[PDB]
């Protein structure tokens, strides 16, 4: 209901938010001590400085008609009728501390052609000159704050965040640009909330809970007014929640937002417009008292709110503004600039429109607002008022009547104890953060907070993206034989190889075979050596005593061939344990049959000659034995011609199983040669059953039959053991040896023990 | 720049979109015919009918001051300055069509206390009476169309959808409400697009292409103004793109939107406010011609545009010959005018009781009184109503209407037409028979979803909070799925049913009686049993024969019996296991071996060296009963049971096994081994004299052979403990061979000398 009026030739209107938006019962409550009173005193100070300037409007004195908007658009629009009710007359309006108020006032003012310059309105909608064609401002739009915030988020690897925004033209227009800029930097948003004009504490707690619903998103982005930010921070403190805040210029660097909720706000990052303090305004504002500053109608209420006193008790005289500290507001410069800009415009008009006189002129009595705005408002160019030493600034408007984009970045920190605000880098055309000043980001404290949906998969895991969400992937493990060729897919190697340590490689593994130094090779080798030594000893004994009647009673040539066969029977253990080659496989295929053929042929001839006792000479006997041996050899030669002498490396469903080196298919030759021997054995047994006759010095073929029986029992009992363990061929070939050696040892003991018994125990 | 003025005692304002929005070049474009001239003539007709009624304002003549908004808010406000310049006087303002114009005008009018009633304005923001405290309307808000659309997009199963909006209050608020309602029902928005105030053809084509980038969403939900819809349809026709359109009342049922783009628009579904046609208005409009309708300044431009003629050969045409199609919202305009008239009549009756002409008290009408006590409390029969209807005019606490809607489809008959298929008041009802593609035998319904349904055997896993999309995953071949999200184990020894929800205990397994591995011995055992029966019969018959007389005992008959029992035991090993079968196997094996070796223990003892016909039998029976004692004690200690086996890589493989472990048998075999070491020892000590027919060296040979067999067999058993099939085959073969050795080695010479060569 109050208005500030100062007489002058030309009157400039003003609009400031002196009072905060009251509650339901009352339209307007408490006073704004920083964004209200100080800005108004700045405008008054600029007017006073202009009115004693000889170079700027020497003969024209500027008046003022200042109103209060009370942070509400309807109240501001109701008050704004005073500017247009005259058509005293108002040339232009320096106003706007909010975007809704500015838009509503511009919509009304454009119908009467009244220029308007704003000092704090940063909405992008106002750059459309087809809708708002009477408007200028000294601040940049919100097109660049979204870019700055997106780059700040991208710097710290924050890819999963949450946006809280306010309702109107500042909050939604800013968040749409932030969402576009996030899209252009591969970022992703989880949830979105909005705050209404009328909101209670319970709804704020609901917003906090909705933010807490997603635990992975620990970063909250705010495009909010100061009151909404204060209430949200208070609610978060009450509910004991912890977030890392990134806020717009609504929070700025105000101390009232974080008053009483210091614990919740610590570690936040905020953006503010770049500015400097003015030295004259401090000395001007620190000399004001209610008994001299009569022209301001809202000063006494501010005095009572500030110093907590009352003029009724006559106790407010002691207090003074000098003793208490002074913290100048950020946008004061902008306010001063706006006023000076308008002044300069009018000066140029007065210089061009009528150069004859210095006072006002009959042509310029009713000022034209189209000419003034279109020609002179947008073409102003001067040096900034009260500029700090060694710094250069300038006052200009773009095509859209907007300012220049420069911002400063602040953190809230806990001192060594009171809380203060510090610069952490500029932002002009690209970020320039200095990470040393932020406490939460020096590495002594800990690693930087995290805001990702899903953690990075391991080198052995692969990524399969879930449809509908880029930021979140599910890790998977590859088969143990599989290597990871690319980030989102892995393949398997060709059989015979194994993944590299880095798992981006294929490597041929260790070919495995039985080795000489193994105990499983040592044992059979020792047994074979002992058998060979025993055979040599028996041969040496028979040779040494070759003239005794008992030795002469038996054949000597057949004894020698049988001893040689026994020796070959033993040597095969050693042949069959040797590393496979081009020659060793041939010996493995040959010697088994050769040994059986030699031994069984010797037995056959011995029984044949005893049974017959034609062609009984020691040479007919040698010929028959050699023919019987050569028969088996014929088959081996044929097999060598029929099949291929070679080897093979295999694999099995269990791919881990190493590629063993084995000989080629040996089915037909071995089994057939089996016949070259088992049939011969059967004939020998038959002739032994027929040799029971004509007893010789011995002719106890009861021993040869027993030998054959024991051999059949032996081998025939290896067949169950084999299938039992068809794997581990290295241990598989630890039965063929130990059966062949046993058969040979049975034959040797059977044939030689009675003769040695006679040789030793009796003279005969 | 032109104004329509009619004199009267009281004046009502008006605001209609007579002209379409012009381009960058000019302020005002071509004339708008349906939401223009028709509505303006409806208002004029309502005023003239009110100005000749016995019961409503009999002594006061109402005037009019009607302006043009040209589809722009800035132009509408510049024109609306005329209403407040008096502060002639304006009693009320029958206001905007589009929501932006209404909001802009209301912001200015609330300052001077001038009531306003709108038509066709459906924005939700206007329901907030803290800001627009002088605004009323006869149409419901946009809070219910979102519900209607979300239920049409759920009757048919659509879940990946796209949205297109117009910049401004109407489109943005509507899309926000629709998104909330869709989330509430599990409907998910694929992509979101916006249309600006000034958009070129390339921008519309870009919007179409952006819609065409995600290809599962084939349904587009438009909540936009009519001109944007027309331009988007033209762009879609040019680029040969096909979608299913769901539109709000901005499209409505206008023929202008679908002029020349019939192919792209076919099959669309739109929503319109519920209304009826008035019959007096048709003849009123159809009777107009430019020579007598001189009070309307915009009529000649409409005539020129409509009939394509120039007044500078215009009299040949007539409006009666052409068909007439009434616009949907004529009733609402008539209702608004009548509501204002009734409010003024009631106020006049309250304040000027003794006169019919205006009195001095009402001379400057008080806006705040008329609106707070008379406008919101009107109630009357809706005028020009159908013969059997009950529509009434009233306002709620927010000055709103009742929410009822109709639903239309666009089809080809060869002319095209709109067809009504249902309505929405509080619950959705629609007839799918009238829709061509929704009718049966036409084919499957158009589909739009993130993921197709999972297979029977598969399970879906999704990220948390992902309510629409689903990622299917195959469960393991041996797992029972608890619910769609998570598969689980079914149970050891069980396999999942065919339906993948049931589970069934696997069948057991035991040797099939026809496997050749087991068949081979059943035959060997039969042959051995036949031989034992033969030998027993021959020796039983010829007891008189001297070969029987020479040895003189019955341990031979015992031994034979034992041999027969050993073969019957090898019959009983290859059998279906049970408790009794386990006991029989665990008794008979030891019994048969101990019997045979005890017998030959007797004969070796007897020939080693009081020897009596009963002492030898007593020793044999004592050794047998000793073995029976041991086996019975060990069977009492370990109760016989049956079990089922399973293991780490068992893959549908079940088994039946005896509860007794293999190693527990070992003790009995140890016993028998010692027995053998004794029999052999004695057979070694008596290796010289042939007491009768050389019957000692044959006994020695038999002892050695049995020792060889046991030495060969024992490790094969331990090595083959791993595999059961080979174990049973080897056990059967070894036992059968061990019996055959004793038989053939000992009983062959006696049979040969008795039968083949009788010489005793
Ligand atoms: C009563 C009858 C006694 C006889 C037995 C007998 C016999 N038996 C051994 C047969 C056999 C077994 C497994 C093998 O797989 C193992 C392997 N092989 N190469 N690498 N690993 C290979 C061969 N071979 C032959 O000479 C051919 N003569 C005879 S006389
Ligand atoms: C952000 O991510 C990049 C990508 O690896 C990394 O190099 C950079 O260090 C991250 N930022 C910080 C502050 O660690
Ligand atoms: C939509 O899904 C429900 C759920 O199974 C189903 O009952 C209904 O039939 C579906 N709609 C149509 C048109 O089939
Ligand atoms: N930039 C803020 C104004 C805040 C202030 O007055 O400091 C807005 O446009 O909403
Ligand atoms: N109901 C639409 C206008 C559509 C019409 O003109 O009928 C709105 O609120 O903007």
> Which H, E and C letters describe B424-485, residue by residue?
ECCCEEECCCCCCCCCCCCCCCCCECCCCCCCCCEEEECCCCCCCCCEEEECCCCEEECCCC
| Pocket mutation for ligand 1, best pick of A736, A742, A744, A747 (most atoms within 8 Å of C-beta) | A736
Cβ B476 under 6 angstroms from ligand 3 = no
d(CA A213, CA B136): 40
Cβ A98 under 6 angstroms from ligand 4 = yes
Nearest listed ligand to the Cα of residue A665: 1
Q: In terms of C-beta distances under 8 Å and separation of at least 24 residues, what long-range contacts does B746-751 make, across chains too?
A: B746/B559, B746/B600, B746/B698, B746/B699, B746/B702, B747/B535, B747/B560, B749/B693, B749/B698, B750/B547, B751/B535, B751/B538
Binding site membership of B for L-glutamate: which residues? 35, 39, 99, 120, 122, 249, 329
Residues of A in contact with B85 (CB under 8 A): none
Nearest chain B Cα distance for residue A706, angstroms: 9
Q: Tokens representing B146?
A: 């979102």
d(CA B385, CA B404): 17
Which of B76, B466, B745 would best serve as a mutation to test chain A binding (most A beta carbons within 10 A)?
B466
Cβ B71 under 6 angstroms from ligand 5 = no
The neighbour count for residue B649, using CB atoms within 10 Å, is 5
Residues of A in contact with B183 (CB under 8 A): none
Question: Helices B99-112 & A99-109, crossing angle to 10 degrees?
Answer: 80
Chain A interface residues (partner B, CB cutoff 8 A): 74, 77-78, 81, 104, 107-108, 110-111, 131, 214, 466-469, 472, 474, 709-710, 713-714, 717, 720-721, 723-725
Residue among B208, B198, B176, B201 nearest B189 (CA): B176
**E strands of B182-290, at which residues?**
188-195, 219-223, 244-247, 269-273
Q: Tokens representing B648?
A: 């780490």
Parallel, antiparallel, or unpaired: how do β-strands B160-166 and B188-195 relate?
parallel
The Å distance, Cα B427 to ligand 3 centre, comes to: 18
Q: Which residues contact B482 (CB under 8 A, 6 or more apart)?
A: B488
Q: Under a CB-based contact definition with an 8 Å cutoff, are residues A120 and A126 in contact?
A: no
When CB atoms are compared, the residue of B74, B108, B131 closest to A74 is: B131
When CB atoms are compared, the residue of B131, B451, B712 closest to A713 is: B712
- Radius of gyration over every alpha carbon of chain A, rounded to an integer in angstroms: 55
Residues of A in contact with B709 (CB under 8 A): 713
Residue among B88, B97, B79, B86 nearest B32 (CA): B97
Q: Under a CB-based contact definition with an 8 Å cutoff, are residues A118 and A377 in contact?
A: no
Minimum CA distance residue for ligand 3 atom 8: B157
Answer whether B722 sits within 8 Å of A720, measured CB to CB. no
d(CA B66, CA B709): 126
d(CA B391, CA B381): 7
Minimum CA distance residue for ligand 2 atom 14: A156
Cβ A479 under 6 angstroms from ligand 2 = no
Cβ A186 under 6 angstroms from ligand 2 = no
Q: A757, exposed or middle or buried, with CB in 10 Å at 0-12, 13-18, 19+?
A: exposed
Resolution in angstroms comes to 3.3
Cβ A157 under 6 angstroms from ligand 2 = yes
Q: Between the CA atoms of B139, B142, B147 and B149, what dihedral angle is there, to the nearest 10 degrees?
A: 100
Answer whether A466 sits within 8 Å of B465, measured CB to CB. no
Minimum CA distance residue for ligand 4 atom 4: A250
The Å distance, Cα A582 to ligand 3 centre, comes to: 74
Q: Tokens representing A160?
A: 């999963």
**Any alpha helices (H) in A690-735, and if so which ranges?**
702-716, 718-724, 729-732
Answer whether B720 sits within 8 Å of A717, measured CB to CB. no
Cβ B157 under 6 angstroms from ligand 3 = yes
Count CA atoms closer than 13 A to A258's CA, side-chain side.
Answer: 25
Q: Under a CB-based contact definition with an 8 Å cutoff, are residues A248 and A273 in contact?
A: no
Answer whether B107 sits within 8 Å of A107, measured CB to CB. yes
Residues of B in contact with A723 (CB under 8 A): 723, 726
Residue among A167, A4, A9 nearest A88 (CA): A9
C-alpha distances in angstroms, B668 versus B58, B627, B671? 130, 8, 5
Q: Tokens representing B376?
A: 């919101």
Q: Tokens representing A213?
A: 């619903």
Superfamily of domain B142-276+404-430: Response regulator (3.40.50.2300)
When CB atoms are compared, the residue of B463, B722, B726 closest to A472 is: B463
The Å distance, Cα B441 to ligand 3 centre, comes to: 18
Question: Helices B73-84 & B99-112, crossing angle to 10 degrees?
Answer: 30
How remote is the C-alpha of B295 from its chain's centroid?
Answer: 64
Q: Tokens representing A517?
A: 């130094």
Instruction: Supply angle C-alpha A626, A632, A634, rounded to 5.
Output: 95
- Radius of gyration over every alpha carbon of chain B, rounded to an integer in angstroms: 55
Q: Under a CB-based contact definition with an 8 Å cutoff, are residues B69 and B16 in contact?
A: yes
Q: How many CB pairs under 8 A join A and B?
A: 61
Answer whether B722 sits within 8 Å of A724, measured CB to CB. yes
Residue A755 among known ligand-binding residues:
no
Answer whether A469 sits within 8 Å of B451, measured CB to CB. no
Grouping H, G, I as helix, E, B as strand and the rest as coil, residue A269 is strand
**Any alpha helices (H) in B69-144, and if so which ranges?**
73-84, 99-112
A165, β-bridge pairs: A194, A223
Minimum CA distance residue for ligand 2 atom 1: A157
Cβ B446 under 6 angstroms from ligand 3 = no
The Å distance, Cα A99 to ligand 4 centre, comes to: 7
Q: Which helix (H) or strand (E) holds A301?
A: helix A299-307
Residue A192 among known ligand-binding residues:
no
Grouping H, G, I as helix, E, B as strand and the rest as coil, residue B188 is strand
Parallel, antiparallel, or unpaired: how do β-strands B28-31 and A482-486 relate?
unpaired
Q: Under a CB-based contact definition with an 8 Å cutoff, are residues B4 and B296 in contact?
A: yes
Residues of B in contact with A710 (CB under 8 A): 708
Nearest listed ligand to the Cα of residue A647: 1
B63, β-bridge pairs: B11
Cβ A102 under 6 angstroms from ligand 4 = no
How remote is the C-alpha of B195 from its chain's centroid?
Answer: 34
Parallel, antiparallel, or unpaired: how do β-strands A473-477 and A461-465 relate?
antiparallel
Answer whether A713 sits within 8 Å of B716, measured CB to CB. no
Q: Which residues contact B148 (CB under 8 A, 6 or more apart)?
A: B271, B405, B407, B424, B428
The neighbour count for residue A356, using CB atoms within 10 Å, is 6
Minimum CA distance residue for ligand 2 atom 12: A156
The Å distance, Cα B154 to ligand 3 centre, comes to: 9
d(CA A159, CA A471): 8
C-alpha distances in angstroms, B402 versus B140, B271, B396, B427, B430? 6, 15, 9, 14, 20
C-alpha distances in angstroms, B557 versus A132, B9, B539, B590, B743? 129, 147, 9, 19, 12
d(CA B479, CA B492): 10
Grouping H, G, I as helix, E, B as strand and the rest as coil, residue A508 is strand
Nearest chain A Cα distance for residue B517, angstroms: 12
Ligand 2: nearest atom to the Cα of A156: 13
Residues of B in contact with A709 (CB under 8 A): 705, 708
The neighbour count for residue B392, using CB atoms within 10 Å, is 11
Minimum CA distance residue for ligand 4 atom 6: A97
Q: Between the CA atoms of A137, A140, A146 and A148, what dihedral angle is there, to the nearest 10 degrees?
A: -160
Cβ B137 under 6 angstroms from ligand 5 = no
Nearest chain A Cα distance for residue B723, angstroms: 7
Q: How were these coordinates obtained?
A: cryo-EM
Which DSSP category does A139 fall into?
Answer: S
Ligand 4: nearest atom to the Cα of A123: 9
Residue B80: closest CA among chain A residues belongs to which residue?
A111
Count CA atoms closer than 13 A to B429's CA, side-chain side.
Answer: 5
d(CA B244, CA B158): 11
Q: Under a CB-based contact definition with an 8 Å cutoff, are residues A546 and A556 in contact?
A: yes
Domain A142-276+406-427 has CATH 3.40.50.2300: yes
The neighbour count for residue B492, using CB atoms within 10 Å, is 10
How remote is the C-alpha of B57 from its chain's centroid?
Answer: 64
When CB atoms are compared, the residue of B78, B107, B465 closest to A77 is: B107
Which DSSP category does A660 fall into?
Answer: B
């Amino acid at each position: 209901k109050k208005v500030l009026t100062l007489e002058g030739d030309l009157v400039l209107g003003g609009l400031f938010p002196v009072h905060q938006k009251g509650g339901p019962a009352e339209d307007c409550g408490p006073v704004n001590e920083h964004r209200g009173i100080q800005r108004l005193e700045a405008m008054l100070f600029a007017l006073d400085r202009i009115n004693r300037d000889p170079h700027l409007l020497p003969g024209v004195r500027l008046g003022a008609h200042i109103l209060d908007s009370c942070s509400k658009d309807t109240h501001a629009l109701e008050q704004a009728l005073d500017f247009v009710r005259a058509s005293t007359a108002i040339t232009g309006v320096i106003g706007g501390s909010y975007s809704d108020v500015s838009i509503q006032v511009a919509n009304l003012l454009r119908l009467f052609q009244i220029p308007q310059i704003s000092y704090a309105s940063t909405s992008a909608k106002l750059s459309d000159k087809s809708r708002y064609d009477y408007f200028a401002r000294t601040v940049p739009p919100d097109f660049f704050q979204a870019k700055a915030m997106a780059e700040i988020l991208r710097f710290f690897n924050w890819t999963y965040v949450s946006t809280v925004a306010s309702e109107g033209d500042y909050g939604e227009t800013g968040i749409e640009a932030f969402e576009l800029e996030a899209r252009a930097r591969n970022i992703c948003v989880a949830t979105s909330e909005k705050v209404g004009r009328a909101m209670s504490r319970a709804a704020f707690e609901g917003v906090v809970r909705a933010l807490l619903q997603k635990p992975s998103a620990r970063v909250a982005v705010l495009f909010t007014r100061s009151e909404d930010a204060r209430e949200l921070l208070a609610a978060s403190q009450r509910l004991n929640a912890s977030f890392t805040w990134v806020a717009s210029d609504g929070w700025g660097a105000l101390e009232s937002v974080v008053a009483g909720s210091e614990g919740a706000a610590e570690g936040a990052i905020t953006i503010e417009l770049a500015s400097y303090p003015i030295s004259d305004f401090a000395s001007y504002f620190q000399s004001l008292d209610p008994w001299n500053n009569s022209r301001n109608p809202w000063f006494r209420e501010f005095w009572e709110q500030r110093f907590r006193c009352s003029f009724r008790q006559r106790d407010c005289a002691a207090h003074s503004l000098r003793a208490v500290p002074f913290e100048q507001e950020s946008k004061i410069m902008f306010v001063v600039n706006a006023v000076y800009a308008m002044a300069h415009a009018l000066h140029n008009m007065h210089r061009a429109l009528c150069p004859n006189t210095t006072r006002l002129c009959d042509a310029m009595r009713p000022v034209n607002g189209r000419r003034l705005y279109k020609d002179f408002v947008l073409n102003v160019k001067f040096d900034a008022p009260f500029r700090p030493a060694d710094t250069h600034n300038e006052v200009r408007f773009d095509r859209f009547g907007d300012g220049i984009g420069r911002y400063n970045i602040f953190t809230y920190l806990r001192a060594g104890g009171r809380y203060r605000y510090q610069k952490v880098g500029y932002w002009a055309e690209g970020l320039t953060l200095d990470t040393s000043l932020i406490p939460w980001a020096s590495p002594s404290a800990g690693p930087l907070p995290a805001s990702r949906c899903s953690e990075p998969c391991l080198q052995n895991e692969v990524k399969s993206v879930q449809p509908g969400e880029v930021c979140c992937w599910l890790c998977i493990p590859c088969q143990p034989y599989e290597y990871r060729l690319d980030e989102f897919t892995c393949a398997d190697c060709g059989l015979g190889y194994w993944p590299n340590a880095s798992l981006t490689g294929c490597f041929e593994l260790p070919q495995e075979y039985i080795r000489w130094g193994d105990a499983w090779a040592v044992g059979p080798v020792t047994i074979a050596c002992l058998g060979a030594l025993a055979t040599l000893f028996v041969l040496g004994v028979f040779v040494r005593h070759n003239a005794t009647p008992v030795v002469k009673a038996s054949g000597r040539e057949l004894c020698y061939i049988l001893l040689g066969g026994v020796f070959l029977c033993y040597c095969m253990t050693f042949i069959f344990i040797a590393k496979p080659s081009t020659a060793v496989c041939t010996l493995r295929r040959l010697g088994l049959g050769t040994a059986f053929s030699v031994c069984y042929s010797a037995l056959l001839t011995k029984t044949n000659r005893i049974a017959r006792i034609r062609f009984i000479s020691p040479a007919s006997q040698v010929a028959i034995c050699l023919a019987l041996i050569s028969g088996q050899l014929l088959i081996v030669v044929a097999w060598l011609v029929v099949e291929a002498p070679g080897t093979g490396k295999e694999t099995a469903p269990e791919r881990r199983e190493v590629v063993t080196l084995r000989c080629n298919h040996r089915d037909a030759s071995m089994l057939g040669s089996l016949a070259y021997n088992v049939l011969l054995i059967a004939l020998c047994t038959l002739y032994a059953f027929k040799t029971r006759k004509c007893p010789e010095n011995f002719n106890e073929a009861k021993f040869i039959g027993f030998t054959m029986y024991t051999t059949c029992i032996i081998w025939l009992a290896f067949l169950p053991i084999f299938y039992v363990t068809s794997s581990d061929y290295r241990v598989q070939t630890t039965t063929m040896c130990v059966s062949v050696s046993l058969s040979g040892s049975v034959v040797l003991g059977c044939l030689f023990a009675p003769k040695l018994h006679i040789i030793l125990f009796q003279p005969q």
